[PDB]
From a paper:
Genomic and biochemical analyses of the [name]-7 strain have revealed that the bacterium secretes at least seven chitinases, one of which is a unique high-molecular-mass (150 kDa) [name], termed [name]. This enzyme has three surface-layer homology (SLH) domains (~18 kDa); it is specifically expressed on the surface of the bacterial cell and degrades chitin. Based on comparative sequence analyses, [name] has two glycoside hydrolase family 18 (GH-18) [name] catalytic domains (~42 kDa each) and one carbohydrate-binding module family 54 (CBM-54) (~25 kDa), as classified in the Carbohydrate-Active enZYmes (CAZy) database. In this study, we have determined the crystal structure of the bacterial cell-surface enzyme [name] and demonstrated that this elaborate monomeric enzyme is composed of six distinct structural domains.
Thus, two truncated mutant proteins have been prepared to determine three-dimensional structures, i.e., [name]-SLHd (Val198 to Lys1418), lacking the signal peptide and SLH domains, and [name]-CD (Val557 to Lys1418), which is composed of the two catalytic domains. The highest quality X-ray diffraction dataset was collected to 2.1 Å resolution from the crystal grown in space. The interpretable electron density map of the [name]-SLHd structure was obtained by the MR method using the [name]-CD structure and the Buccaneer software, and refined at 2.1 Å resolution. Based on the crystal structure, [name]-SLHd was functionally divided into three regions: CBM-54, the GS (glycine-serine)-rich loop and a catalytic region. The CBM-54 was predominantly a right-handed parallel β-helix (Ala214 to Phe449). The GS-rich loop (Gly450 to Asn463) connecting CBM-54 and Ig-1 domains consisted of consecutive glycine and serine residues with a length of 35 Å. The loop is located in the catalytic cleft of Cat-1 of the symmetrically related neighbor molecule in the crystal. In the crystal structure, the location of this cleavage site is on the SB2 face and in front of the 11th β-strand at the fourth coil from the N-terminus. Although it is unclear whether the two cleaved segments of [name] (120 kDa and 30 kDa) coexist on the cell surface, the crystal structure also indicated that the two polypeptides bound tightly to each other with 13 hydrogen bonds between the third and fourth coils and they retain the β-helix fold.
Author numbering:
A (entry chain B): 283 to 1416
B (entry chain A): 214 to 282
Write the structure that this text describes.
């Protein structure tokens, strides 16, 4: 034998005759190619070097030569016609090849041997228990045999090879051995539009039991068993499918499943499922969210992405620390200074604080964005990736966020030089994502709080080609698809930038993108569709067609993008820009003959939401929340669509912008226009006559309907004007239905009939409450009847089911223990006041003075309303009182049916229907009275703002009996609560979504069916307020402390002598059109909410523009200046 | 350089030769050599051993003899 100890040999040729030479390689030995032309045994013993590598059995090999190999070989080649046998006794061969020349070749592979690749080019017998990882059976290898089956077989003659014994590959194989246990295998999970979670699994050993625990995205643990809950389960053979209730919270659910058989309890298996309905709202870091006045209503989305965190020195920092951003040389020095001071920490605190208004809200940090540098380097190596990931988690943890999103724009191509990029970005992005997912999971083992990981992705094929979708997707809760900026002024012709569908072959869309992503393996479940709250603009577009798909010239001056709020304010159907719709793409655009604007609106948002639901996608993402309209119409539309109840189509909704046309004489109606914006649904750019129905326009007066000029989405009803057939003494209710056929959206239903008003020639009413506990005859401040049309005298009361003077209500007379007040109340100056009112009625002979029966704590209504007999008695008595004291009608102020102001007065459930019967009877009797007395008597009520009031009264059944309802659009907030707010605001502040205003209250009355012309808006001549109010935003919408020193209800006169310029500063909520006072020094901070001359002007303006009957206020005594009244009166005359 | 010996070669020190060698008999160790040119082993090595300790062959090795043991 020949030993080759720590040696070096080159090529070796073996022509040993008759019996083999053994050749050994020991230690650091090194051998070239061994060429075999005789009998031989290669052996590698105690080998530290590489030893043998290539071996070839050549055609010179003699018949029956013995050739055996032990060791680790590379390529071994049997190329010998003399019926060669190769024995491989131990070790490994990378590639063993049996050549076409090697007739009757036999290959004997001993049990520990591993051949990674065996290639057969001649029919070969392979023997022994040795292993072959892949047998490549080419045509010449057809019919080859293996005593033990190769791991895989490839090549054209694969199917011809035989394996195993005479049994067939793997043998008689039987048994065993004692199986039994319940195993659960997970098949898959799914969601639907209804937000059910569906869990499918194969349960071996189905013993009619199993237990599932669900963890909500907000952490709620929940358990389901076949025992309690087989209603939610369905069994087949191994197939079992669990089905949750509808309406689960959108986002990522964690589940565990296990089966048993009494004691023998299965391996617990776990996973993640995804519930449809996510709304990802991007919020920009560069708005100062603490100072913002436009507001954020986080009830309309599920996720808030803080855009953006940045990368500096391979770590994650606030955007103020990113010099690429703060030192942009393209802006002004003052602009850079604002950037350097960007209030990130304040922002982040304000935004997580919105959880109070939506507790399910997740807030994530989004890292990166357009022109954000640092990713290629951050991802470059295992240590760069480690610093980054750790940094990202610090950010997340520092601000108490719910997860991390990356927006790298973009791997590999770097958006073509905008950022640094390299080829390695592609695998590096995968590794970075892997790492982050690892670290977030690690941390959750401690915190027991699940963290999301997500990205924003490019829509282009270039982007999909630059990342490893199938590889990264398992690390991601979802991909946010940037299905916007699809086309833009960089294109030589105009197109849509964010369309749902591709209408022409080269137009990209949401649909083209989603199809690209699905085609690369990404699941629907994990795809968020993108929308934009901004437009892409082209200038110098040829003035052809509609501008769409037309050539554009120079973009030199171009703004590039215009944010949706600016489009609403100044472009959509404004300033010569025509609104058009592409009914194949489902996208709107504007054109003025030279500028083309592609954008996203209410209609495209609805088609996009419907695409998402139709394809069972993850939800709707948008850039960015602050670009929306004042009302947040895009955000609201998105929420409405994705959260719509299956089986009920959305109704078209309206509001009113111009709701009054006023008669010039008793019979001459001038031309005029009613304007009604849609609140839900989007008109065709051009409507037709059959799309709107109008009722109530007088006979012989013609009208047309059209889209209103200078509005984006409003109906105009043009009343032609003419001569009404008989005198018009009272308002005419006009009702406008916007039909399903009017709008762009596909399956909406008709709007409810919207009420607007033809006003009779004297215009709106102006009603003052005049308190009867003021002795007017002797009051230095008098009532100016030239400025009122109406007075309500507060109050008459009910005693023994009879109407009596207020001095007969002993509850009221003795309200206070003061013996002076009791005496003054017993002697309430009603008779003197009635002679006074009568003198008023001389210097304004058109004045109406009504008696108000009831008021706060006034008893007797629930009893009076109970039977036909009590109603009769109260009505007859109220009428006798009316006539006896010279009144022109009756107002009833029942405070309040059903709930009794929470136990202040008696109440019953029956008050709801009985109030209707009471009013009906009062109207009948007053018709009788009128027909006897030669005159008309009014019937009105005072009514309340709260939803409980609305639910406690039949508004749609009572309006018919009433001249109007004086709605108490005040006392919304006060000392009974600890947080400050507007007690009387005409509009709901942008900073208090869903809050009370005149607008919100009077809309809700109208949505119950009450005509605009039976509504009266209420002003308050007194304030409400809070003490211990923090000096933040001048006390507005602040949590307040102990209220024992609360100022109660100062009147405007009190405000004048004690508050104004006494350390109180007057502020103005412009979205609410409401004033307030703050004094940091008064009692820990004092905040006052009231009406003033400005807010009453706006109430009055609201009345005129909405077609209301008029304005009312409480009360005449509370402003001895005449200025509050003068403000109303001047605006109603104007 | 055609051997027929015993343990023929250097000690702790590597030693260069050249030309076509012909170790023609059993038991012949060769050590710390570095042979430019060929190494032959001939039918004369028969059924017996031949060790090679820290050798080098820049040319062709040609095993025509030796046994299994
Ligand atoms: Na080897």
């Amino acid at each position: 034998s020949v030993h080759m100890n720590d040696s070096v040999i080159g090529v070796v040729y073996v022509d040993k005759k008759d019996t083999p030479v053994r050749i050994v390689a020991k230690g650091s030995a090194k051998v070239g190619e061994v060429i075999i032309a005789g009998s031989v045994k290669l052996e590698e013993t105690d080998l530290t070097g590489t030893g043998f590598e290539k071996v070839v059995l050549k055609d010179l090999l003699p018949a029956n030569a013995k050739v055996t190999l032990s060791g680790s070989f590379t390529d071994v080649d049997v190329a010998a016609s003399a019926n060669p046998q190769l024995n491989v006794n131990s070790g490994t061969i990378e590639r063993l090849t049996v050549a076409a020349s090697s007739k009757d070749a036999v290959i004997v592979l001993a049990s520990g041997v591993k051949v990674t690749t065996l290639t057969l080019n001649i029919k070969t017998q392979i023997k022994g228990q040795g292993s072959v990882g892949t047998a490549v059976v080419n045509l010449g290898g057809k019919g080859s045999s293996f005593e033990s089956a190769p791991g895989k077989t490839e090549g054209i003659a694969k199917d011809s090879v035989t394996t195993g014994g005479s049994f067939g590959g793997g043998g008689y194989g039987g048994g065993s051995g004692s199986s039994s246990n319940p195993v659960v295998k997970l098949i898959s999970t799914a969601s639907n539009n209804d937000r059910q979670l569906v869990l499918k699994f194969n349960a071996y050993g189905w013993d009619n039991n199993a237990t599932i625990v669900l963890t909500s995205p907000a952490g709620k643990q929940t358990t389901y068993t076949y025992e309690k809950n087989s209603a939610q389960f369905a069994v087949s053979a191994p197939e079992v499918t669990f089905t949750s209730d509808k309406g689960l919270a959108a986002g990522t659910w964690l589940y565990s499943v296990k089966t048993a058989k009494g004691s023998v309890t299965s391996d617990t298996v776990t996973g993640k499922a995804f519930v449809q309905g996510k709304i990802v709202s991007y919020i920009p870091a560069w708005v100062d969210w603490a100072k913002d006045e436009r507001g954020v209503d986080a009830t309309k989305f599920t996720h808030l992405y803080y855009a953006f965190g940045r990368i500096n020195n391979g770590k994650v920092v606030t955007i103020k620390e990113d010099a690429k951003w703060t030192e942009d040389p393209t802006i002004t020095e003052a602009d850079r200074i604002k950037r350097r001071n960007n209030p990130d920490e304040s922002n982040l605190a304000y935004l997580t604080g919105l959880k109070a208004k939506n507790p399910n809200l997740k807030v994530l940090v989004s890292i990166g964005g357009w022109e954000a540098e640092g990713f290629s380097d951050a991802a470059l190596t295992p240590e760069s990736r480690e610093v980054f990931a750790n940094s990202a988690l610090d950010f997340m943890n520092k601000y108490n966020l719910d997860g991390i999103d990356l927006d790298w724009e973009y791997p590999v191509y770097g958006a073509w030089g905008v950022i640094k990029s390299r080829p390695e970005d592609k695998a590096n992005f995968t590794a970075l994502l892997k790492l982050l997912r690892e670290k977030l999971d690690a941390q959750s083992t401690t915190t027991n709080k699940y963290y999301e990981l997500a990205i924003a992705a490019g829509a282009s094929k270039t982007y999909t080609d630059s990342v490893e979708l199938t590889k990264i997707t398992p690390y991601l809760d979802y991909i946010n698809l940037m299905t916007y900026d699809l086309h833009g002024g960089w294109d030589p012709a105009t197109s849509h930038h964010t369309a749902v569908y591709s209408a022409t072959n080269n137009q990209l869309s949401v649909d083209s993108t989603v199809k690209l992503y699905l085609n690369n393996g990404v699941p629907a479940e994990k795809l968020m569709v993108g929308g934009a709250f901004y437009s892409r603009v082209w200038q110098n577009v040829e003035n052809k067609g509609t501008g769409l798909s037309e050539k554009a010239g120079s973009q030199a001056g171009s703004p590039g993008t215009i944010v949706y709020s600016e489009l609403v304010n100044n472009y959509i159907n404004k300033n010569g820009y025509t609104r058009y719709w592409d009914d194949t793409a489902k996208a709107p655009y504007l054109f003025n003959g030279s500028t083309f604007i592609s954008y996203e609106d209410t209609a495209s948002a609805a088609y996009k939401a419907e695409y998402i639901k139709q394809n069972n996608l993850a939800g709707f993402m948008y850039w960015e929340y602050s670009q929306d309209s004042d009302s947040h119409e895009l955000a609201n539309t998105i929420y409405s669509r994705l959260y719509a109840k299956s089986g009920t189509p959305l109704s078209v909704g309206t509001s009113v912008y111009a709701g009054t046309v006023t008669m010039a004489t008793y019979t001459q109606l001038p031309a005029g226009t009613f304007i009604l914006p849609l609140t839900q649904g989007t008109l065709k750019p051009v409507i037709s006559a059959s799309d709107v129905t109008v009722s109530g326009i007088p006979a012989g007066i013609t009208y047309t309907v059209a889209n209103a000029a200078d509005h984006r989405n409003a109906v105009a009803v043009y009343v032609n004007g003419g001569t009404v057939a008989s005198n018009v003494y009272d308002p005419i209710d006009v009702r406008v239905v916007v039909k399903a056929s009017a709008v762009l959206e596909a399956n909406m239903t008709d709007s409810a009939p919207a009420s607007v008003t033809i006003m009779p020639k004297f215009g709106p009413i102006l009603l003052g409450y005049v308190p009867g506990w003021v002795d007017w005859t002797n009051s230095a401040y008098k009532v100016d009847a030239t400025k009122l049309t109406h007075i309500n005298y507060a109050f008459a009361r009910i005693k023994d089911n009879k109407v009596v003077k207020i001095s007969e209500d002993i509850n009221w007379v003795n309200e206070f223990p003061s013996e002076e007040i009791r005496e003054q109340r017993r002697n309430n100056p009603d008779d003197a006041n009635f002679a006074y009112l009568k003198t008023l009625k001389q210097q304004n002979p058109s004045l109406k003075v009504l008696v108000s029966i009831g008021g706060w704590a006034a008893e007797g209504f629930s009893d009076a309303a109970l039977t036909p007999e009590t109603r009769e008695e109260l009505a007859n008595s109220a009428i006798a009182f009316m006539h006896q004291y010279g009144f022109d009608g009756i107002d009833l102020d029942w405070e309040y049916p059903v709930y009794g102001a929470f136990g202040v007065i008696k109440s019953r459930p029956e008050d709801k229907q009985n109030f209707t019967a009471l009013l009906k009877l009062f109207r009948e009797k007053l018709d009788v009275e009128g027909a006897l007395h030669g005159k008309y008597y009014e019937l009105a009520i005072a009514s309340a703002a709260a939803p409980i009031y609305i639910n406690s009264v039949e508004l749609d059944k009572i309006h018919q009996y009433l001249d109007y309802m004086s709605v108490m659009t005040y006392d919304y907030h006060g000392s009974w609560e600890s947080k400050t707010a507007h007690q009387a605001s005409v509009y709901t502040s942008a900073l208090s979504p869903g809050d009370f205003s005149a607008d919100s209250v009077l809309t809700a009355y109208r949505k119950q069916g009450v005509p605009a012309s039976k509504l009266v808006i209420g002003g308050a001549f007194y304030a409400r307020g809070w003490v211990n109010v923090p000096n933040i935003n001048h006390g507005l919408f602040q949590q307040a402390g102990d209220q024992a020193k609360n100022p109660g209800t100062p009147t405007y006169n009190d405000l004048v002598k004690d508050y104004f310029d006494k350390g109180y500063t007057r502020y103005w909520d412009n979205s609410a059109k409401a004033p307030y006072l703050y004094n940091p020094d008064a009692n820990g901070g004092t905040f006052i909410t009231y009406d003033d001359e400005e807010s009453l002007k706006y109430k009055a303006e609201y009345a005129k523009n909405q077609g209301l009957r008029g304005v009312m206020f409480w009360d005449y005594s509370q402003d001895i200046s005449g200025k509050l009244l003068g403000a109303i009166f001047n605006e109603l005359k104007a | 350089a055609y051997d027929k010996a015993g343990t023929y070669g250097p000690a702790s020190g590597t030693e260069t030769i050249d030309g076509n060698v012909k170790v023609t008999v059993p038991g012949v160790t060769l050590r710390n050599l570095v042979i430019k040119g060929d190494l032959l082993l001939s039918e004369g090595v028969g059924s017996g051993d031949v060790t090679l300790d820290k050798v080098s062959v820049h040319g062709l090795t040609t095993v025509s003899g030796g046994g299994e043991n």
